[PDB]
Amino acid sequence: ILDAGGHNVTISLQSRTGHTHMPSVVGVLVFTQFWFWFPLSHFLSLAYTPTCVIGLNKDLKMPKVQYKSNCKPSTFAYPTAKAKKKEKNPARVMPAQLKVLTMPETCRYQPFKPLSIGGIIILKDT
């Protein structure tokens, strides 16, 4: 559980938009009792959802972008000046570290939409 997805992903039953995630709830409720049916422990893999910041600008093209996070490196430890992240393979991120991060000011590619949560978002060429 704690290491699920190499610590990069976790279970999320509630999206930021306010809608519940059906396969995660369905995954964990069938996962409730593993004693009767042992393979029910595999159904929890559906409950795993990726938590990452995806810097994909659009389509197939992958820009190179690094932006700063204000949290200390102690929060970045996954067993300061600026964080080093993708540049979209995206990079893992904590839901608590998504509010402190800021879009790059001096980079050529800047998001048109205000950046708040992670996932895949638009990145506009400036």
Partner: protein
């Protein structure tokens, strides 16, 4: 070969013949036989239970009478359902219902003939009401010493069967033997009527008579036990008025309370029987 978690589906008629055949022999241990059908490895059912006669050899593999088995199965053939035999059982009223040396001495014969032949033991002594009691036993194969001795899979009924861990001398048989789970299948209509059958005790005999017998006595000589209850009023409450003063001396609770609580509140619940059933007189006497 293949081993999976086992469950014994039992019929109430089987359990009835179990404890009935075990109660009539107390203290002496009796010998029965289990009847049912083998559906598969991971599930088993006992749909009937019949009793073997007691002989001079005692409880032994020779105590089973072959001509009794031939005539019983013939009597089962004229009976509605002539199902095939499965396993054996013997009661142990005098002790903690553990398998003895003769029990395994007949177990290699029952495992010879029948593939499974689950051994069941039952005793009346342990609990008078609220426990399944009984017991369960199955002989593990000594030829399995090569491979591992620790199945099954789907540990649900297994890990829940082991608890309490059943003492020491009983789980001293957990080496070379293992228990098996028992569940009560419904058959809800018969279970419900037989539920009310014993409820006739604490409810009423007919659900009418016994508390119309409470309308027979009905305060009658029932004030005599109220006079003894009001003697329990005087007795218990004359030492109950000594308690709160002593509480002020010792400062305060000695933990305690003496209890010396409730009690005659129930006598006032019989006063609810007084007011109700006597208020029925206005309905009885008038029309």
């Amino acid at each position: 070969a293949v081993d999976t978690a086992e469950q014994v589906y039992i019929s109430s008629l089987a359990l009835l013949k179990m404890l009935k055949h075990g109660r009539a022999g107390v203290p002496m241990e009796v010998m029965g036989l289990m009847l049912g059908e083998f559906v598969d490895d991971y599930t088993v059912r006992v749909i009937d239970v019949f009793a073997m006669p007691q002989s001079g050899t005692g409880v032994s593999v020779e105590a089973v009478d072959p001509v009794f088995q031939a005539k019983m199965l013939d009597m089962l053939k004229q009976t509605g359902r002539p199902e095939m035999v499965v396993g054996w059982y013997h009661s142990h009223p005098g002790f903690g219902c553990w398998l003895s040396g003769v029990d395994i001495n007949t177990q290699q014969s029952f495992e010879a003939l029948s593939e499974r032949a689950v051994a069941v033991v039952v005793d009346p002594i342990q609990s008078v009401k609220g426990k399944v009691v009984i017991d369960a036993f199955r002989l593990i194969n000594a030829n399995m010493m090569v491979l591992g001795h620790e199945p099954r899979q789907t540990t649900s009924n297994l890990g829940h069967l082991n608890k309490p861990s059943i003492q020491a001398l009983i789980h001293g048989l957990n080496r070379h033997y293992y228990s098996i789970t028992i569940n009560y299948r419904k058959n809800e209509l018969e279970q419900k009527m037989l539920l009310n059958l014993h409820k006739k005790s604490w409810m009423e005999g007919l659900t009418l008579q016994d508390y119309s017998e409470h309308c027979k006595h009905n305060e009658s000589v029932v004030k005599e036990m109220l006079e003894l209850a009001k003697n329990y009023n005087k007795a218990v409450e004359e030492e109950d008025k000594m308690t709160p003063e002593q509480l002020a001396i010792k400062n305060v609770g000695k933990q305690d309370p003496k209890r010396h609580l409730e009690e005659h509140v129930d006598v006032l619940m019989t006063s609810n029987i007084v007011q109700c059933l006597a208020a029925m007189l206005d309905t009885v006497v008038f029309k």
